């Protein structure tokens, strides 16, 4: 456990210094952050609000990527580094849970965060540090449902074929629009 008195603006950090049991929850908005922070067990669980929609790194200039405040906050939290400073042996958390809202917009933020993680934090995903919350709200509502280790249900993100993975991201969240609209016309039942 930490001792405090040390030194992001947001991100309610826990009280432990063991990146083997500690967990970081990436939730969307401060509206969700308050509910999650008011019942997270301030010991091995820290929360970090992602304000607005995360930048699609699969279509953004690397200059804009390094400029995004939101990505800078997430990387600053993990303490892994970036690119050449990628040190997975220095991650401040062994459990990065993505907790987006149940609505479609939350689902979109899940895909964005996944692309960001898969592209510039692959050593994390390759090590199985990334999870996805499985919500079925008050403080005890989120705690006794999704934030309690004794209960709850997690979704360990695991990649099978990197080639298929690299293709999926490029197809869906890539620059080429035509290949995307085709996938919509193919795998989608409306009526």
């Amino acid at each position: 456990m930490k001792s405090g008195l040390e030194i992001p603006g947001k991100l309610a950090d826990c009280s432990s210094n063991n990146p083997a049991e500690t967990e970081l929850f990436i939730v969307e908005g401060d509206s969700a952050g308050g509910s999650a922070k008011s019942g997270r067990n301030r010991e091995f669980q820290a929360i970090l609000p992602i304000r607005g929609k995360i930048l699609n790194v699969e279509k953004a200039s690397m200059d804009k990527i390094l400029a995004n405040e939101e990505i800078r906050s997430l990387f600053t939290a993990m303490g892994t580094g970036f690119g050449a400073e990628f040190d997975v042996s220095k991650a401040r958390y062994q459990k990065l849970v993505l907790m987006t809202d149940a609505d479609v917009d939350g689902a979109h933020i899940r895909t964005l965060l996944l692309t960001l993680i898969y592209r510039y934090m692959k050593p994390i995903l390759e090590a199985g540090y990334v999870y996805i919350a499985q919500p079925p709200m008050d403080d005890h509502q989120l705690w006794e449902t999704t934030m309690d280790p004794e209960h709850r249900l997690m979704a360990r993100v695991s990649v099978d074929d990197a080639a298929e993975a690299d293709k999926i991201f490029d197809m869906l969240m890539g620059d080429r629009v035509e290949p995307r609209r085709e996938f919509i016309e193919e795998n989608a039942v409306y009526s």
Binding site: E21, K95, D103, V104, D105, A107, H108, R110, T111, L114, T115, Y118, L125, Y131, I132, Q134, P149, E150, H151, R152, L153, M154, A155, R156, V157, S158, V159, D160, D161, E164, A165, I168, F169, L172, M173, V177, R180, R181, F183, I184, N187, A188, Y190, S191
Partner: protein
């Protein structure tokens, strides 16, 4: 750590989450419905306003009140997103035919943002009422709201082709729609034309519907793209600002703009000109002053001596947004699926939805007209046998027995029996019968007429045509955008 942990494939989860957000944006946010030409937020604002009782007849209500009920009963999103969507359909430059009458600062053409919701008040426009006409006669299906404790309409009646008339846009996922506004009367003429002569070709339709009619006016250059868009749903068009050269009181040329292109900010082009004049990218300009008033747009670009206004004019057309291009991408939701429809396909889609609305209404009117006459038949026989009726009642202990006897004695249904039991004593006067007879007789006529309309498809079309003529007769405008070659 955790106990029950599952495993999710990255490629699997990503495709699922994206496919969800994809369809969600397509058929439930971005693109509009081909029938009423409305998107979810626009339809919920209109319907929400209808229930709020803010019709053209009634007074205005605070904007916060309108978005408060729409967001709390129909549209499950941010308050601002609803207010902005409302303010836009109250601006003469944004909507070819406004659907919202506002009171207060609703923004300006110069990109000014409307005042906060705690200042502006709005209500339905006179024409917007046509979008809701006969909404309560079961002409549109309804569905549960997001909260599953309120009922909203999937579509609206829409007694005027709102899609072609107000246009659409546009940004979704994997796709994007872009439809230009049209003149009301012209669009209605197009509808009527396609109804009387099914073998009408695109050219024949363009005879009554020449092309786009933007709210600001301006000019259209090249009609080749116009025919291409109507026949394929896709096409490119050139939009140019209406201008004219004046001579100053000193004796030098004066470039005057009066009608910029659609969705073009005057101030934005004003800043763009100074940025080009002070950059030496365009020389010959003496001054660029905006003399536009609250009664006309006047953007003057005076030229110095020994400098051609025409040379500077075309340069502004080719370097500024004073002359842009409109990318026809007539995409709309039809049969739950997004489709790129042509002009005939959009019209035929409106005429069909128009036929269904009229039939549903005729049925509803018929079903209610007869249901009333049935009761009138009961109340009549009751008023004929008031004594024996009053005797059966008073001699009864329970209403169930009293009703049962009336049904058996006078041969009346359960509904007719209750109607007699609920009769006020004031209905037992002498002049009360002749009144009920006059009403009943009128019901017989209406039921006969409505029975015929549902029996003859020829009448339903004629009813649509006649009703359309009334819409145009009351709301149609004169053409603003001059199409030229």
């Amino acid at each position: 750590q955790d106990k029950n942990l599952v495993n999710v494939n990255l490629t699997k989860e990503m495709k699922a989450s994206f496919i969800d957000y994809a369809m969600s944006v397509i058929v439930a946010r971005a693109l509009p419905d081909v029938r009423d030409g409305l998107k979810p937020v626009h339809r919920r604002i209109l319907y929400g306003m209808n229930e709020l009782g803010v019709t053209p007849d009634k007074p205005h209500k605070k904007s916060a009140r309108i978005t408060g009920d729409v967001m709390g009963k129909y549209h499950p999103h941010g308050d601002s997103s609803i207010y902005e969507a409302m303010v836009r359909m109250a601006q003469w430059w944004s909507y070819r035919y406004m659907l919202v009458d506002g009171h207060g600062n609703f923004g300006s053409m110069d990109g000014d943002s409307a005042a906060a919701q705690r200042y502006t008040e709005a209500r339905m426009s006179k024409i917007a009422l046509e979008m809701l006409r006969d909404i309560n006669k079961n002409t549109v299906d309804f569905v549960d709201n997001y909260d599953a404790n309120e009922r909203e309409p999937l579509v609206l009646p829409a007694r005027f082709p709102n899609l072609l008339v107000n246009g659409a846009t546009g940004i979704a996922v994997g796709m994007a729609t872009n439809i230009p506004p049209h003149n009301l009367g012209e669009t209605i003429d197009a509808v009527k034309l396609v109804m009387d002569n099914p073998e009408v070709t695109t050219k024949d339709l363009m005879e009554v519907l020449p092309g786009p009619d933007f709210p600001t006016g301006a000019l259209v250059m090249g009609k080749s793209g116009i025919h291409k868009a109507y026949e394929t749903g896709k096409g490119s068009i050139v939009l140019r600002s209406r201008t004219e050269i004046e001579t100053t009181k000193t004796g030098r040329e004066r470039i005057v703009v009066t009608e910029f292109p659609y969705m073009v900010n005057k101030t934005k082009v004003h800043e763009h000109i100074v940025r080009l004049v002070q950059e030496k990218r365009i020389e010959g300009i003496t001054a660029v002053r905006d003399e536009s008033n609250r009664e006309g747009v006047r953007f003057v670009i005076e030229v110095k001596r020994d400098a051609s206004a025409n040379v500077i004019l075309n340069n502004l057309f080719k370097m500024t947004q004073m002359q842009t291009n409109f990318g026809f991408n007539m995409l709309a939701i039809q049969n739950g699926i997004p489709k790129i429809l042509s002009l005939r396909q959009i019209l035929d889609a409106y005429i069909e939805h128009q036929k269904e609305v009229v039939v549903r209404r005729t049925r509803f009117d018929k079903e209610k007209a007869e249901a009333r006459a049935h009761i009138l038949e009961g109340l009549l026989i009751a008023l004929d046998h008031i004594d024996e009726v009053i005797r059966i009642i008073r001699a009864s202990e329970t209403d169930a027995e009293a009703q049962a006897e009336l049904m058996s004695k006078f041969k009346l249904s359960e509904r007719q029996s209750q109607a007699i039991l609920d009769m006020r004593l004031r209905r037992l006067t002498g002049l009360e019968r002749d009144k009920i007879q006059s009403e009943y007789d009128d019901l017989l006529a209406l039921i006969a007429d409505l029975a015929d309309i549902l029996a003859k498809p020829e009448r339903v079309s004629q009813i649509i045509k006649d009703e359309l003529d009334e819409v145009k007769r009351k709301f149609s405008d004169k053409r603003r955008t001059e199409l030229m070659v």
